[PDB]
Amino acid sequence: GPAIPIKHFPKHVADLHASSGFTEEFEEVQSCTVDLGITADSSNHPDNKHKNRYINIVAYDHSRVKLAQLAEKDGKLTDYINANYVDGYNRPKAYIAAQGPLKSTAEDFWRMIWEHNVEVIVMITNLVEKGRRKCDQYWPADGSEEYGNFLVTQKSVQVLAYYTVRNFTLRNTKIGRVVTQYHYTQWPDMGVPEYSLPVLTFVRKAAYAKRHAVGPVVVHCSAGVGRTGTYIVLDSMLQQIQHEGTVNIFGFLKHIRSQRNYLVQTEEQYVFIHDTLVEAILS
Ligand SMILES: [Br-]
Ligand SMILES: [Br-]
Ligand SMILES: [Br-]
Ligand SMILES: [Br-]
């Protein structure tokens, strides 16, 4: 879509609400990648079957995050994690959009953080939400833990009303790096947040914290698509706003859809990005 100058964004969004035009727009987002030769052979390989948290959520072959290969006794692939490189506001591969690790993929996850020089994780889920398992705890409750060759140590935790920051060290014990996790803890278990400011605030604090990071920021929720996508669009659009005073949700989203399936999974989430940014702009 066109870049909308911030001055006209509130009206653009009010007009979408009044015309009920979000449904049609989100419907073009959903079909925007069917003609591009995208494949997901790795995600569907029998060796990887237990590494996927959800059978309908795959990591496209061209943009999937590859792990280095190991030759193990079982002879099975080891280059695979359900995650994808995703572009940001004029920064190719600014994010890794990942599913929440399982117990069986926590070592893979840490190995991805090591091999891809990740220093920030953004987590937008609780572990269990109203009886639904969303994500396994992949970090030590207290002190230290080993996940294969990866030693994670929790140096400190700051708890705030809407998110928590955990400060870890990561070591590859086959040979320290700081990794900071921003964990948003108040996303409702259904729907989208009723109030956008806490989410805005989280996004801004995270963005400060990653502002000099040389490698990608890992973003996950449970499937790594809906809430993950919503964060990615918010973060990138706050950058667009600051640097060009414009917003382009529709075009940006269509582009990242080529990198990972279902990023911004629901129309509600699409709408919530727009409402959150109107609010941001109006103060
Ligand atoms: Br890519
Ligand atoms: Br799990
Ligand atoms: Br290793
Ligand atoms: Br989720």
Sign of the CA dihedral running 236, 240, 243, 245: negative
Find the catalytic residue in 135, 179, 219, 221: 221
- How many other CB atoms are there within 10 angstroms of residue 128's CB atom? 13
221 is catalytic: yes
Q: Are 111 and 146 in contact (CB under 8 A)?
A: no
| Gaps in the chain following residue numbers (C to N > 2.5 A) | 175
How is residue 7 annotated by DSSP?
A: G
Which residues, chain by chain, have CB under 5 Å from ion ligand 1?
A: 63, 85
User: Which helix or strand (DSSP H or E) is residue 148 part of?
Assistant: none
Q: How far is the CA of 58 from the centre of ligand 1 (A)?
A: 15
| Rounded Cα distance, 31 and 28, in Å | 5
Q: Which domains does the chain have, with CATH numbers?
A: 1-283 (3.90.190.10)
User: Is 265 within any annotated ligand binding site?
Assistant: yes
Burial string for 183-211 (b: 16+ CB within 10 Å, else e) reads bbeebeeeebbeebebbbebbeebbebbe
Q: How many CA atoms lie within 13 A of 237 on its CB side?
A: 30
User: Is 189 within any annotated ligand binding site?
Assistant: yes
Nearest to 99 by CA among 129, 40, 54, 47: 54
How is residue 174 annotated by DSSP?
A: T
| Rounded Cα distance, 102 and 109, in Å | 9
Q: How far is the CA of 191 from the centre of ligand 4 (A)?
A: 11
Q: Which residues contact 98 (CB under 8 A, 6 or more apart)?
A: 65, 81, 82, 83, 84, 109, 112, 218, 219, 220, 224, 228
User: Is 225 within any annotated ligand binding site?
Assistant: yes
Q: How far is the CA of 260 from the centre of ligand 1 (A)?
A: 9
Give all strands (DSSP E) within the chain, no chain letters. 4-5, 64-66, 80-88, 91-98, 120-123, 128-129, 132-133, 144-147, 150-159, 163-172, 177-184, 217-220, 246-247
Q: Are 16 and 25 in contact (CB under 8 A)?
A: yes
Ligand found nearest the CA of 129: 4
Q: Is 147 helix (H, G, I), strand (E, B) or coil?
A: strand
